[PDB]
Enzyme design. Sequence first.
Site, PDB file in Angstrom:
ATOM      1  CE  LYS A 144     -10.409  -7.260  -4.416  1.00 23.40           C
ATOM      2  NZ  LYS A 144     -10.020  -5.901  -4.633  1.00 23.40           N
ATOM      3  CE  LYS A 154      -3.046   2.042   2.589  1.00 28.20           C
ATOM      4  NZ  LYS A 154      -3.696   2.415   4.073  1.00 28.20           N
ATOM      5  CB  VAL A 171      -0.235  -0.375  -4.290  1.00 31.06           C
ATOM      6  CG1 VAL A 171      -0.983  -1.738  -2.892  1.00 31.06           C
ATOM      7  CG2 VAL A 171      -0.368  -1.115  -5.210  1.00 31.06           C
ATOM      8  CB  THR A 210     -12.808 -10.786 -24.607  1.00 30.69           C
ATOM      9  OG1 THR A 210     -12.252 -11.697 -23.605  1.00 30.69           O
ATOM     10  CG2 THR A 210     -14.439  -9.842 -24.404  1.00 30.69           C
ATOM     11  NE  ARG A 223       8.294  -2.041 -24.486  1.00 34.73           N
ATOM     12  CZ  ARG A 223       6.709  -2.294 -24.885  1.00 34.73           C
ATOM     13  NH1 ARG A 223       6.247  -1.192 -26.210  1.00 34.73           N
ATOM     14  NH2 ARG A 223       6.667  -3.390 -24.744  1.00 34.73           N
ATOM     15  NE  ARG A 273       5.944 -12.811 -26.193  1.00 39.08           N
ATOM     16  CZ  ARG A 273       5.661 -12.162 -26.010  1.00 39.08           C
ATOM     17  NH1 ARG A 273       3.667 -11.766 -25.940  1.00 39.08           N
ATOM     18  NH2 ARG A 273       5.762 -11.532 -26.084  1.00 39.08           N
ATOM     19  CG  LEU A 280       4.774  -0.162  -3.962  1.00 38.09           C
ATOM     20  CD1 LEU A 280       5.140  -1.405  -4.638  1.00 38.09           C
ATOM     21  CD2 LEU A 280       6.245   0.438  -3.950  1.00 38.09           C
TER      22      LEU A 280
HETATM   23  N1  LIG Z   1      -3.763   5.083 -26.990  1.00 39.33           N
HETATM   24  C1  LIG Z   1      -3.853   4.205 -26.256  1.00 39.33           C
HETATM   25  N2  LIG Z   1      -2.109   3.946 -26.926  1.00 39.33           N
HETATM   26  C2  LIG Z   1      -1.437   2.457 -26.041  1.00 39.33           C
HETATM   27  C3  LIG Z   1      -3.010   1.933 -26.090  1.00 39.33           C
HETATM   28  N3  LIG Z   1      -2.147   0.711 -25.847  1.00 39.33           N
HETATM   29  C4  LIG Z   1      -1.302   0.035 -26.069  1.00 39.33           C
HETATM   30  O1  LIG Z   1      -0.521  -1.091 -26.696  1.00 39.33           O
HETATM   31  N4  LIG Z   1      -0.786   1.395 -26.702  1.00 39.33           N
HETATM   32  C5  LIG Z   1       0.691   1.793 -27.698  1.00 39.33           C
HETATM   33  O2  LIG Z   1      -0.091   0.977 -28.889  1.00 39.33           O
HETATM   34  C6  LIG Z   1       1.571   0.733 -29.563  1.00 39.33           C
HETATM   35  C7  LIG Z   1       1.965  -0.924 -29.827  1.00 39.33           C
HETATM   36  O3  LIG Z   1       0.525  -1.658 -29.058  1.00 39.33           O
HETATM   37  P1  LIG Z   1       0.919  -3.227 -29.426  1.00 39.33           P
HETATM   38  O4  LIG Z   1      -0.681  -3.551 -29.006  1.00 39.33           O
HETATM   39  O5  LIG Z   1       1.838  -3.985 -30.028  1.00 39.33           O
HETATM   40  O6  LIG Z   1       1.254  -3.763 -27.836  1.00 39.33           O
HETATM   41  P2  LIG Z   1       3.043  -3.845 -27.872  1.00 39.33           P
HETATM   42  O7  LIG Z   1       3.929  -3.807 -28.873  1.00 39.33           O
HETATM   43  O8  LIG Z   1       4.065  -2.827 -26.449  1.00 39.33           O
HETATM   44  O9  LIG Z   1       3.290  -5.135 -26.803  1.00 39.33           O
HETATM   45  P3  LIG Z   1       3.034  -6.665 -27.606  1.00 39.33           P
HETATM   46  O10 LIG Z   1       3.196  -6.926 -29.111  1.00 39.33           O
HETATM   47  O11 LIG Z   1       4.395  -7.516 -27.230  1.00 39.33           O
HETATM   48  O12 LIG Z   1       2.082  -7.608 -27.433  1.00 39.33           O
HETATM   49  C8  LIG Z   1       2.450   0.670 -28.217  1.00 39.33           C
HETATM   50  O13 LIG Z   1       3.387   1.358 -28.260  1.00 39.33           O
HETATM   51  C9  LIG Z   1       1.446   1.509 -26.615  1.00 39.33           C
HETATM   52  O14 LIG Z   1       1.727   2.789 -27.036  1.00 39.33           O
HETATM   53  C10 LIG Z   1      -4.027   2.071 -25.076  1.00 39.33           C
HETATM   54  O15 LIG Z   1      -4.587   1.615 -24.778  1.00 39.33           O
HETATM   55  N5  LIG Z   1      -4.046   3.649 -25.913  1.00 39.33           N
HETATM   56 NA    NA Z   2     -10.579  -9.154 -27.201  1.00 40.59          NA
HETATM   57 NA    NA Z   3      -0.801   3.426  -1.827  1.00 34.62          NA
END
Ligand SMILES: Nc1nc2c([nH]c(=O)n2[C@@H]2O[C@H](COP(=O)(O)OP(=O)(O)OP(=O)(O)O)[C@@H](O)[C@H]2O)c(=O)[nH]1
Ligand code: NA
Ligand code: NA
EC number: 2.7.7.7
Length: 326
Positions: free
Chosen positions: A63, A51, A56, A92, A174, A140, A53
């Site tokens: 939890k 908490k 949290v 989903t 990244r 992946r 942090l």
């Molecule tokens: N505006 C907005 N941008 C998002 C959201 N989620 C999300 O991942 N992005 C952006 O979308 C870009 C790519 O989305 P992504 O689904 O491929 O996620 P990722 O590359 O980090 O991971 P992954 O490809 O290994 O699963 C990211 O750089 C991120 O900034 C969101 O909820 N809102």
């Molecule tokens: Na979905």
């Molecule tokens: Na807190």
Amino acid sequence: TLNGGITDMLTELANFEKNVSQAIHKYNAYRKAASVIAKYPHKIKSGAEAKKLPGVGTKIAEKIDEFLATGKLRKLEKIRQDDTSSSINFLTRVSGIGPSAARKFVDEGIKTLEDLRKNEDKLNHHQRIGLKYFGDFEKRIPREEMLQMQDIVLNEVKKVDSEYIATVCGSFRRGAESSGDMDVLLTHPSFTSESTKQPKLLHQVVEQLQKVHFITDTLSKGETKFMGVCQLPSKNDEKEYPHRRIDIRLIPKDQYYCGVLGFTGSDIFNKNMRAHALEKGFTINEYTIRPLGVTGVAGEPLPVDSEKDIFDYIQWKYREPKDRSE
DNA sequence: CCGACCGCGCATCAGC
DNA sequence: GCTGATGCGC
DNA sequence: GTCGG
Ligand SMILES: Nc1nc2c([nH]c(=O)n2[C@@H]2O[C@H](COP(=O)(O)OP(=O)(O)OP(=O)(O)O)[C@@H](O)[C@H]2O)c(=O)[nH]1
Ligand code: NA
Ligand code: NA
Ligand SMILES: [Cl-]
Ligand SMILES: [Mn+2]
Ligand SMILES: [Mn+2]
Ligand SMILES: [Mn+2]
Ligand SMILES: [Mn+2]
Ligand SMILES: [Mn+2]
Ligand code: NA
């Protein structure tokens, strides 16, 4: 993995609030707590220790205590038993089936991978492609395979016009060892914030990629963003590469660095960075970074020479893309 | 206690 | 035919 | 669900 037990429990509760309860702010609160816990150096031994942090509160702390005392949590355990909750949670997982379409299907008696196959007439194009590559999308991509796609894509874009600049971003930028999809940022000098001097800019690139038999399907397609499926080639009757999700986003060339920042990630990092921008008097977007006076309305975009230039405006010490994954 | 939790592109659909 | 609301993935 | 106000 240092505290994977708490994060996995907070992550599943996040996805339950998003897919079933449809409370997106509870989903974000759980993800914000799971992230700040995943960056905690010491091993979590108390709910009171958590908490302290930021992110949290009391409810997650108790939890957490219930988890460290038993190794489980009754709340999550009873959600796993709920057939409708678990059916929506599974529906989903298909790309294109969100929390609303999943709940409607469950109330109609559609709740399995076959039930969706029998009612393929009820799904739109995005949902059928999500059904088609359901297993392939859950896999992946190793970084080594991503490097093959990077050179396939980056070479195919200059085949069309050598004044094309494609930048693979997201998880790959990244430095991740394996990635969920591939995120491509594409620029053309004839497309800027002031005018578009050439049409079919993104279309020509998407068309070329599928002529090489790289792009296999199309989820969304417009003048700026493309969402679809790609696949690496295979030779000598080797087992075919699994189909992968790919996103292509054409960006104004004069707004390149703010888009590289926005599509590199992580989504939790961008959220925290964007929130700290208004904390100091700016609004960060996928395109611009405008100052904030007292008008409540953003000003005119600021000169951005680097990705670090955006950090400098809000006076944040620059973080390399490898340290941006939260 | 209390409201604020990012903002974009594309698709689909209801209503006209 | 068109516009707006909404869902969806990010 | 959390936290700044
Ligand atoms: N505006 C907005 N941008 C998002 C959201 N989620 C999300 O991942 N992005 C952006 O979308 C870009 C790519 O989305 P992504 O689904 O491929 O996620 P990722 O590359 O980090 O991971 P992954 O490809 O290994 O699963 C990211 O750089 C991120 O900034 C969101 O909820 N809102
Ligand atoms: Na979905
Ligand atoms: Na807190
Ligand atoms: Cl409240
Ligand atoms: Mn059945
Ligand atoms: Mn993903
Ligand atoms: Mn990605
Ligand atoms: Mn396949
Ligand atoms: Mn500079
Ligand atoms: Na993506």
